[PDB]
Write a protein that binds this ligand. Structure first.
Ligand SMILES: Nc1ncnc2c1ncn2[C@@H]1O[C@H](COP(=O)(O)OP(=O)(O)OP(=O)(O)O)[C@@H](O)[C@H]1O
Ligand SMILES: Nc1ncnc2c1ncn2[C@@H]1O[C@H](COP(=O)(O)OP(=O)(O)OP(=O)(O)O)[C@@H](O)[C@H]1O
Ligand SMILES: [Mg+2]
Ligand SMILES: [Mg+2]
Lengths: 51, 72, 262, 50, 285, 101
């Protein structure tokens, strides 16, 4: 909030999307959106509970 | 027809509809089925039973004499 | 006259069916159409306010959209195909040696159906639902047909996969209207034939097809239990391997007896 | 005109045959979709402090 | 194609109320044990209906959504009926199979109706029977229909943030599983309270559940409800709703209108099923 | 974990006892307290290893205070909350034994 970044909390989810719908193809694109709306913080929270 | 966590649960829903039309509400009394299969190890237990496939024809390995007929 | 009747139909036009979704005002009604999108529509003085209630089908015009008359309910084209199965009949003793299994079967089924009045004495909850399980060939479907004939009540006889459709959401609609129909028709007895993969587990790591399974499965339990409860009207669940089903179908109370046919 | 128009900009139409009228005063960012459905408000160091 | 009139919230319902035009059918007396969880369901439902402001004056964060989880049969849904009967507020019985996609725009429109109705004639309870067919831990999201189910759940998230700061009771939902749940639904601010329901419970909480279904039915002077408490120790609530129901069927083979212990132990033997917690497979004492 | 892409490692340890007292205070800034409650005294009753445990002690104190229906959160509710949350530590998964090999 101080730095004025977009706080993008990812969580290892397929529910946050509904427009591409898999995480693999949303690595380039997530970067490109965070560059549109830069500055940004991509908080990719991995969990590793998945499977 | 016990499958978990895969899309063979889509596959069996076209198997059960066939077994529905081989249950007797007739319409399988002159309407018949031939079936060829190459593997007889994985056939459904609801097709082992008679009322579905009734007559069970084995196809052998040809005998001595039979091979000569086939060639000819 | 055979052609005069055709003239009179021809110079008329069709009607388009709705049902009263919600009353708004005296002359304005909200309907949800059988084709879909909701409208606000009017009324003639050919219908009364005391003659309309909700879920009652109404006519509309396709040129002004106004109700002229009350319309009876609708019921699937699909469920009429199930009432046309009745063949495969057998006598009341039609399973040799499993006659004992008939006795167990009627205690849930035939006796409270005919007289709920003796079970008031007992003081227990209204009997509902049974599972037949056993290896193929033991006349689980035959026992289904035999309790259909002998009781002689309204009967279906649902294929597992003639209540599935391409669209995921029409598959839910059919059985919703199938339980409604069973309540319109005293002693309607419902054989689900070969449930395995339409009442199966949560699965959902395979195809998208597996989400239609759930969707349909919830439907069954909500009819059976909620602010709808069935004591007139009986469930026979025929399955070909016992442990194929969701645990909610392994929870007796919808399915009170799990009868083994040896 | 074409120099007031750029990609990913929402517009309003008066359908005289789909005649572009004005820009729309609303857009929903596609990055904001992810963030919405997550749903996060802002924090500072009194939520960490100590 | 212009806006010619406006419509009240009340009208244009998905379905009309069931809680000030009907009355829930199951009372809190038909719930036996889970007394620890009963202190919690009157915290979760009853106190935000009579007055939300009690929380405000303390300054403690409210509970928002109610999550019921457990293996099925443990009376999650029965309990919803229960506290709605005691509080005597509005209740709306909808399901997610009345929300499911059928037309374009069906999904969002149908989610919105129920919240509008609840808020206008608040304080209200919204019940969604289950959310296991909408909310699934995983989605393929490579087909149009899987993104429709997702549109329906996403609206539900949006309406849930909307529902907050209101004297309504935030949506009730139950789940039969642990892998129906996503890490964006159980977030606090969406589902705050997670009321447990085990298949474990202790000897006291098994004990009350037998006695209530015996209160419903006739009994004999030789009927024992308390000889069943220790036979099995992994029970759910409605597996007892079957054993008792079956005792009234075995009795009718006799032509009896009281329940015998012969009837009740013969029904005990079935519906339990394979269990390894019971005292015969136990030699670790 | 390839060497050179990790130039900062932020380990959050289990709370200190100066830190653990302030977590109790953070939550209490929305709440009403009966004057004289030290959440440092409660912190010496706690031993902890996560600041999740102390968030549950505050939630419990205001729900005990809700049960009473008093505006203030009273001081015995913070006594009861620590023992209630510790029972809850033995029921989410055991972790404090001292019983080791
Ligand atoms: N238990 C039985 N006793 C007497 N006849 C039987 C029995 N089971 C099957 N039959 C005979 O077999 C015919 C067909 O069997 P049916 O279609 O009833 O098989 P099923 O194994 O019950 O079906 P499913 O495999 O779908 O459960 C019946 O019409 C009847 O003549
Ligand atoms: N523990 C119980 N004791 C007595 N009756 C019960 C019990 N649980 C459920 N019932 C009765 O069983 C019927 C259905 O209950 P309900 O559908 O609420 O249960 P549920 O466990 O929430 O179901 P599900 O497995 O679908 O989640 C009702 O008639 C109800 O009164
Ligand atoms: Mg059959
Ligand atoms: Mg449920």
């Amino acid at each position: 909030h101080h730095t004025d970044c977009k706080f993008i909390r990812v969580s290892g989810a397929e529910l946050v999307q509904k427009y591409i719908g898999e995480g693999s193809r949303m690595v380039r694109e997530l970067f490109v959106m965070a560059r549109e709306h830069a500055p940004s913080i991509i908080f990719m929270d991995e969990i590793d509970s998945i499977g | 027809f016990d499958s978990e966590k895969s899309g063979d649960r889509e596959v069996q829903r076209t198997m059960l509809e066939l077994l529905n039309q081989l249950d007797g509400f007739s319409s399988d009394d002159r309407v018949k089925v031939l079936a060829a299969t190459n593997r007889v190890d994985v056939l459904d237990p609801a097709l082992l039973r008679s009322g579905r496939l009734d007559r069970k024809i084995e196809f052998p390995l040809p005998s001595e004499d039979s091979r000569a007929q086939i060639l000819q | 006259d055979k052609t005069e009747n055709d003239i009179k139909a021809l110079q008329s036009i069709g009607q388009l069916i709705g049902e009263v979704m919600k009353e708004l005002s005296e002359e304005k009604y909200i309907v949800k159409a059988s084709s879909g999108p909701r409208y606000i529509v009017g009324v003639r003085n050919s219908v009364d306010r005391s003659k309309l209630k909700k879920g009652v089908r109404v006519t509309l015009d396709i040129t002004t959209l106004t109700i002229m008359r009350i319309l009876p309910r609708e019921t699937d084209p699909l469920v009429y195909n199930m009432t046309s199965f009745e063949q495969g009949e057998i006598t009341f003793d039609g399973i040799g040696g499993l006659t004992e299994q008939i006795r167990e079967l009627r205690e849930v089924i035939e006796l409270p159906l005919k007289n709920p009045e003796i079970f008031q004495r007992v003081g227990i909850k209204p009997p509902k639902g049974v599972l037949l399980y056993g290896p193929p060939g033991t006349g689980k479907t035959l026992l289904a047909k035999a309790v259909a004939a002998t009781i002689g009540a309204n009967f279906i006889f649902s294929p597992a996969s003639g209540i599935v459709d391409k669209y995921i959401g029409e598959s839910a609609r059919i059985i919703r209207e199938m339980f409604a129909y069973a309540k319109e028709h005293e002693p309607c007895i419902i054989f689900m034939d070969e449930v395995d993969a339409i009442g199966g587990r949560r699965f959902s790591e395979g195809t998208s097809a597996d989400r239609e399974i759930q969707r349909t499965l919830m439907e069954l339990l909500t009819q059976m239990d909620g602010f709808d409860n069935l004591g007139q009207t009986k469930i026979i669940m025929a399955t070909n391997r016992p442990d194929t089903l969701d645990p909610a179908l392994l929870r007796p109370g919808r399915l009170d007896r799990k009868v083994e046919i040896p | 005109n074409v120099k007031d128009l750029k990609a990913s900009q929402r517009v309003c139409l008066r359908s005289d045959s789909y005649m572009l009228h004005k820009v729309l005063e609303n857009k929903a960012d596609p990055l904001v979709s992810l963030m919405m459905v997550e749903k996060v408000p802002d924090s500072t160091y009194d939520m960490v402090g100590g | 194609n212009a806006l010619v009139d406006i419509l009240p919230p009340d009208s244009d319902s998905s379905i009309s109320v069931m809680g000030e035009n009907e009355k829930p059918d199951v009372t809190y007396a038909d719930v036996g044990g889970l007394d620890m969880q009963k202190q919690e369901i009157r915290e979760a439902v009853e106190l935000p209906l009579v007055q939300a402001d009690l929380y405000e004056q303390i300054g403690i964060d409210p509970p928002r959504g109610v999550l019921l989880y457990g293996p099925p049969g443990t009376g999650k849904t029965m309990l919803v009926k229960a506290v709605a009967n005691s509080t005597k507020a509005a209740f709306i019985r909808v399901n997610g199979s009345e929300f499911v996609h059928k037309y374009l725009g069906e999904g969002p429109r149908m989610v919105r109706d129920v919240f509008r109705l609840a808020r206008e004639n608040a304080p209200s309870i919204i019940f969604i029977d289950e959310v296991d067919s909408i909310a699934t831990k995983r989605f393929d999201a490579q087909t149009g229909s899987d993104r429709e189910v997702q549109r329906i759940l996403i609206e539900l998230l949006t309406q849930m943030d909307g529902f907050d700061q209101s004297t309504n009771v935030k949506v009730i939902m139950a789940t039969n599983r642990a892998d129906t749940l996503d890490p964006a639904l159980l977030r606090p601010g969406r589902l705050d309270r997670k009321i447990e329901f085990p298949s474990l419970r202790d000897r006291r909480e098994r004990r009350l559940i037998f006695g209530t279904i015996a209160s419903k039915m006739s009994l004999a002077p030789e009927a024992d409800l308390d000889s069943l408490i220790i036979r099995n120790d992994s029970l759910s609530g409605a597996v007892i709703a079957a054993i008792m129901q079956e005792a009234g069927l075995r009795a009718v083979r006799k032509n009896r209108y009281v329940i015998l212990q012969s009837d009740l132990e013969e029904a005990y033997a079935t519906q339990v099923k394979t269990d390894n917690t019971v005292d015969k497979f136990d030699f670790y004492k | 974990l390839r060497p050179g892409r990790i130039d900062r490692k932020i380990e959050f340890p289990p709370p200190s006892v100066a830190a653990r007292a302030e977590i109790l205070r953070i939550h209490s800034r929305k709440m009403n307290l009966t004057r004289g409650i030290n959440l440092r005294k409660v912190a010496e009753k706690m031993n902890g290893c996560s600041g999740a445990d102390v968030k549950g002690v505050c939630t419990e104190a205001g729900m005990y205070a809700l049960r009473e229906r008093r505006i203030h959160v009273t001081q015995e509710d913070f006594e009861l909350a620590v023992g209630k949350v510790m029972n809850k530590n033995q029921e989410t998964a055991i972790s404090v034994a001292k019983l080791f090999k």
